Amino acid sequence: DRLVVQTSSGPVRGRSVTVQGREVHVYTGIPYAKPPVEDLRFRKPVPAEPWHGVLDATGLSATCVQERYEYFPGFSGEEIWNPNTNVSEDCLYINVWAPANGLPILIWIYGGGFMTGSATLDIYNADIMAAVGNVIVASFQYRVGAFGFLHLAPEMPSEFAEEAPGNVGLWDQALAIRWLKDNAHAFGGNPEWMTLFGESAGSSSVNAQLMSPVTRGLVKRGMMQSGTMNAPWSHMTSEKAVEIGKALINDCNCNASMLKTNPAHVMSCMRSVDAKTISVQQWNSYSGILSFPSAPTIDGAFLPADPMTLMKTADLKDYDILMGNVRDEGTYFLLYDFIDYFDKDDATALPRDKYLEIMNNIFGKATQAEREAIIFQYTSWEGNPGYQNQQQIGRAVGDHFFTCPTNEYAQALAERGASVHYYYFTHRTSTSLWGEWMGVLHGDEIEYFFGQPLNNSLQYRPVERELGKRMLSAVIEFAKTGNPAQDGEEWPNFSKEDPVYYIFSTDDKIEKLARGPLAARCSFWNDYLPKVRSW
Amino acid sequence: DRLVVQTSSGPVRGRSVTVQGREVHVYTGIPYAKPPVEDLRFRKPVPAEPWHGVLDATGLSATCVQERYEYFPGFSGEEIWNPNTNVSEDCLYINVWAPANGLPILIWIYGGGFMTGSATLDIYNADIMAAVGNVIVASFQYRVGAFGFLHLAPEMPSEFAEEAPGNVGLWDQALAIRWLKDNAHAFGGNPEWMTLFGESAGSSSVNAQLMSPVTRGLVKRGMMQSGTMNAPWSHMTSEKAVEIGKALINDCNCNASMLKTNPAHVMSCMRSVDAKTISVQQWNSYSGILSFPSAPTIDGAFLPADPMTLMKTADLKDYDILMGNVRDEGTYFLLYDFIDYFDKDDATALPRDKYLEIMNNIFGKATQAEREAIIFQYTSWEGNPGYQNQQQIGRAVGDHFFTCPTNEYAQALAERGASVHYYYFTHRTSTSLWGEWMGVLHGDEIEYFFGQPLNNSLQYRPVERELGKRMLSAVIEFAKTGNPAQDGEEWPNFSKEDPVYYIFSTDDKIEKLARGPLAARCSFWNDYLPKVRSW
Ligand SMILES: *[C@@H]1O[C@H](CO)[C@@H](OC2O[C@H](CO)[C@@H](O[C@H]3O[C@H](CO)[C@@H](O)[C@H](O[C@H]4O[C@H](CO)[C@@H](O)[C@H](O[C@H]5O[C@H](CO)[C@@H](O)[C@H](O)[C@@H]5O)[C@@H]4O)[C@@H]3O)[C@H](O)[C@H]2NC(C)=O)[C@H](O)[C@H]1NC(C)=O
Ligand SMILES: [Cl-]
Ligand SMILES: [Cl-]
């Protein structure tokens, strides 16, 4: 069977697909760890015991346990982020796309705030990327939610360290990535030619996999799409995670208080709560939009320090980073945690009642000083009263939570020596089923970097297919060379001294290279606001 | 002699001028007080003793004592603000323009920061205004500098109150204005139809004459051009003025310390210092650009409270105010107190070295909190690095010192009931001999409101003559009706609720009525910065 690869853990059988002239053998569902169930819930992953028969790697994996958004029933645009397959803890599986010293390897880490996401959503279909880019794309489920990130070792004696260390979702990724290096050659790939790439929490996970002392050196080439660990939603102190963790582990009626005189009876209890109940109970430590109960946790291990402290010493000499943002980052989340105020589909005339309403809630955790500074920075006199006030909050959240943290991380990375290219995705895809006011939603760049516009069975305007064509190629070229730039197309490095970024759109009369606008927007958050925080 | 008017103090003979079809009898040099010399230096004005023969009112008055700027030798544009006539304390004279129940009376108060200025500069020639507007224009010298504003009564016993009360320059104006009401009919005018109008400190002086309990009711119709008493350069506490005054009165080697055991030997000393030496010594208490040693002083008399406290109770029911600003207010003064950094004529690429340089000096008297807030509010990323940084300081000073104080005063006035119309002068006159980067200098609106474009012996573009035509007419129509608006031309009142302003320019494709831009610029100074001043 030419559709069989013998992996380090056994032969596997995949499917053949012919995309765009190339044949691709797509193997989905390869286990890379023991199903982290029963005893192994909350623990680091153990590698999968090898199998003998040819494993059926044609079915899609099961999706890691998570709840699913349905603030818009039926509305496809929401369910495309919801698990398309059965949800079970049995979810630690790999997917590998291999075309028919080895091809380059792109490993996809999905996003979803360490709380959601699956490698199997069709948005993540790597068929076109593998065929067109002639590269090996892999992906994999990692444990998300409390299943991946519950952290309680500080509250337990030393012997119980491996009971709930935290970050096992990242360890999962580490393991999956380690699995892929081992089996690179067996699928036709160069194990040293590996490239991580991901979006949001996936983008952040790429980040962690690149920086972590646990994994460092495994791969020094990463693409991060709107997700950096310095962002507030993408890192979390140990002591916070223990508070969240202690809440959940009696939110689940498991005591949580004897965690240190007789702990893992608390665990044994948490080992026998149904997953669905944790999958819903975890969210009650969520409020403060975009501060989820699970995050890369400073743990003395995978994340030994705060990300920016880690950056101070890291020397990223040989690292290639391709990172960026989409124009209207924060607008997907504004619609979600303030659906009370905003419409799915049409714009909102937001008043000033409702503007301070919303701004003051989002930022209550900050000084009145910087609260007022933010409110004034995102006041819009010249805009159509209302529409421009709604639109200015979507900027505020887009800026504070995504663009400006990754702008900051991008500058820190280049300072440490990494070769950083920055992109800004500003095209609204013609089939955006979201409200036009939300413009370029967070995640809208995914399908473009995967080359989905090239899918002639998907109605995209012609020059949108040329934007996919280009965006997909920048990812391939990056993976191949560390440099997303094309021939005769300039796209120089992004440094603090020259924070130039490429702009992907399909207006062919904008300046492709730009520096000013992003730097201005992020000067507020990254330079000025820190000064306001002086009491 | 048909060119003779018998005034309350004597017959006077003027000249006939035929301007634009009308004959105007222009009487310059009528005394309205005793020359405030010798004993009367620093004191309130006494009315002029009457004369018998027909007084020669054809010569121009002598200009009140003041020094003169010559940071640009020969360069006419500077000397046009310098005294065109002999400078002497003998300077308290009136000028009256009368065309051949009485015509309306416009009284012109010149500006110059209570430190400079003369009613006789040709810029202030009211020939065209009188003829075209068929109105009586009057003007008059008031004592400026230490001669008009030295304030020492608090430091003296009660008996010495009238020795140096402060504000005698304003009392001068009060007297001159009182003189003009008395002799209104004798020149062909309606004494009740009076209108004050002035520019900068003149604008502020109009303000004071309208609000002062001393003069209030005398005239309730005023035009204020870029000068309101709430502005920092236009009011000053008593205790500050005493410090300044005590400095000058031994800056002039007159002891200053025995001011309260045996004072007016200090005065007698100051009564015998040559005027020129005070005229130069007064300036050594000047530094901090646009905070002059003389200002309307809170004195318990002419200015009984801070201007904004006075506003809280004033009820301006029957007051008509026509006020406004020019586009680049602060740029004349930026060139002056920072000539080290900026060229007379061409723009300056200002660095960021030099940007914080300049901003930090201007505003040292403010918290680091608001210092930084200002620096960030006037940072320009998208502008041509340099030019836009120079240009952004000229805005900062234009805004803080003129536009936004008068914007604030304008709102306070309307709240108290005054009928306020607001204008914004944005045309750069084609013969601006200043650097193009300074755009619309402070004072550039004067010659336009006086109708000087109508002077066919002065080369102005055709539509600039239509801007003078219009600006002059708005002043006449205001004086006649309290409303600068024309027929079929909308120009509604300016209130805090609808801070709409008319825009004078000669691009006929701008929106004449506008609200947003000024309100945005002044929101910083008038709303946000006060909040930053909370420690
Ligand atoms: C371009 O755009 C197209 C339009 O959106 C898009 O379309 C479609 O292709 C997908 C996959 O090729 C179709 O998806 C399901 O429907 C198929 C038939 O309609 C199903 O057979 C299949 O289901 C099941 O197949 C999975 C394949 O990975 C697998 O998880 C399971 O089973 C399989 O394999 C074993 C052994 O080979 C068999 O025994 C099973 O029968 C099964 O085949 C699972 O049970 C597809 O998941 C979809 O319907 C197509 N149409 C539409 C409208 O979506 C393209 O994918 C886009 N991409 C490219 C590159 O063209
Ligand atoms: Cl080919
Ligand atoms: Cl006529």
Does residue A85 contact residue A118 with C-beta atoms inside 8 Å?
A: yes
Q: Give the C-alpha distances (Å, rounded to integers) separating A150 from A87, A171, A235, B68, B421.
A: 19, 13, 13, 77, 65
The structure was resolved to a resolution in Å of 2.5
Does residue A149 contact residue A169 with C-beta atoms inside 8 Å?
A: yes
Residue whose CA is at the smallest distance from ligand 1 atom 25: A59
d(CA B218, CA B302): 14
Write out the residues surrounding ion ligand 2, Cβ under 5 A: A 21
Q: Which of A175, A172, A157, A151 is nearest to A270 (CA)?
A: A151
Does residue B118 contact residue B79 with C-beta atoms inside 8 Å?
A: no
d(CA A229, CA A205): 8
Residue of chain B minimizing CA distance to A379: B520
- With residue B395 as reference, give the H or E element that holds it: helix B387-398
**Pocket-testing residue among A457, A459, A460, A465, ligand 1, by greatest number of atoms within 8 A of Cβ:** A457
- Could you say which of B381, B524, B528 has the minimum Cβ distance to residue A516? B381
Chain centre distance of CA B179: 20
How much distance in Å is there from the Cα of B24 to the middle of ligand 2? 93
Q: Give the C-alpha distances (Å, rounded to integers) separating A393 from A233, A369, A379.
A: 18, 18, 9
Q: Which of B201, B257, B210, B263 is nearest to B232 (CA)?
A: B201
- Could you say which of A373, A381, A531 has the minimum Cβ distance to residue B516? A381
Ligand nearest to the CA of B131: 3
Which own/partner contact pairs does B371-380 have at CB distance under 8 Å and 24+ positions apart? Answer: B372/A528, B372/A531, B372/A532, B373/A373, B373/B524, B373/B528, B373/B529, B373/B532, B374/B400, B374/B524, B374/B529, B376/A523, B376/A524, B376/A528, B377/B524, B379/A523, B379/B355
DSSP secondary structure, B151-215, as one string: B-GGGS-GGGGGGSBS-HHHHHHHHHHHHHHHTTGGGTEEEEEEEEEEETHHHHHHHHHHH-TTT
Contacts of B372 in chain A (CB under 8 A): 528, 531-532
Q: Which of B338, B364, B317 is nearest to B438 (CA)?
A: B338
Say which experimental method was used: X-ray
User: Domain containing A433: what range?
Assistant: 1-535
Residue whose CA is at the smallest distance from ligand 1 atom 34: A58
d(CA B335, CA B361): 15
Residue of chain B minimizing CA distance to A380: B520
Q: How many CB atoms lie within 10 A of CB B67?
A: 17
A200 belongs to the catalytic site: yes
A289 phi/psi in degrees, rounded to 5 = -55, 135
On the 0-12 / 13-18 / 19+ scale of CB atoms within 10 A, B13 is middle
d(CA A409, CA A483): 18
| Nearest CA-CA distance, residue A198 and chain B, Å | 31
On the 0-12 / 13-18 / 19+ scale of CB atoms within 10 A, B535 is exposed
DSSP secondary structure, B86-117, as one string: -B-S---EEEEEEE---EEEEEEE--STTSS-
d(CA A153, CA A170): 16
d(CA A172, CA A475): 24
> DSSP label at A260?
T
- Residue to substitute from B376, B407, B511, interface A, most A β-carbons within 10 A: B376
- With residue A28 as reference, give the H or E element that holds it: strand A22-31
How much distance in Å is there from the Cα of B34 to the middle of ligand 1? 104
Q: Which of A117, A111, A142 is nearest to A233 (CA)?
A: A111
Number of helical (H) and strand (E) elements in chain B, helices listed first:
18, 14
Shortest-distance atom of ligand 1 to CA A125: 58
Q: Which residues are within 8 A (CB) of B353 and not within 5 positions of it... i.e. 6 or more apart?
A: none
Number of residue pairs across A and B with CB atoms under 8 Å? 34
Chain breaks in chain A (C to N over 2.5 A) after: 100
The residue type found at A43 is R
Q: Is A457 in the pocket of ligand 1 (CB under 6 A)?
A: yes
Query: For B339, what's the count of Cα atoms within 13 Å in the CB-facing half-sphere?
Result: 9
CATH code of the domain in which A347 resides? 3.40.50.1820
Q: Is A458 in the pocket of ligand 1 (CB under 6 A)?
A: yes
| Sign of the Cα pseudo-torsion (B176, B181, B182, B187, in order) | positive
Q: How many CB atoms lie within 10 A of CB B471?
A: 24
Contacts of B532 in chain A (CB under 8 A): 369, 372
| Nearest CA-CA distance, residue A382 and chain B, Å | 6
d(CA B530, CA B535): 10
Active-site position among B9, B89, B442, B477: B442
- Residue to substitute from A531, A533, A534, A535, interface B, most B β-carbons within 10 A: A531
- Residue to substitute from B500, B525, B528, B534, interface A, most A β-carbons within 10 A: B528
> DSSP label at A31?
E
Contacts of B519 in chain A (CB under 8 A): 381
| Nearest CA-CA distance, residue B389 and chain A, Å | 14
B30-53 in b/e form (b: 16+ CB < 10 A) is: bbbbbbbeeebbbbbbeebeeeee
Chain breaks in chain B (C to N over 2.5 A) after: 100
d(CA B141, CA B176): 9
Q: Is A128 in the pocket of ligand 1 (CB under 6 A)?
A: yes
Contacts of B369 in chain A (CB under 8 A): 369, 532
Shortest-distance atom of ligand 1 to CA A455: 1
What's the total number of domains in chain B?
1
d(CA B43, CA B47): 12
Q: Which of A386, A350, A340, A399 is nearest to A518 (CA)?
A: A399
Provide the phi-psi class of A103: left if phi over 0, else alpha when psi is between -120 and 50, else beta: beta
Whether residue A373 and residue B372 make contact (CB cut-off 8 A), yes or no, is no
Cα angle B195, B199, B201 (rounded to 5 degrees) comes to: 105
Q: Which of B533, B240, B235, B239 is nearest to B409 (CA)?
A: B235
Cα angle A252, A254, A256 (rounded to 5 degrees) comes to: 105
**Pocket-testing residue among A455, A465, A472, ligand 1, by greatest number of atoms within 8 A of Cβ:** A455
Radius of gyration of chain A (CA): 22
Strands A10-13 and A4-7: antiparallel
Q: In this structure, what token pair is assigned to residue B367?
A: 């918290």
- Could you say which of B369, B372, B381 has the minimum Cβ distance to residue A519? B381
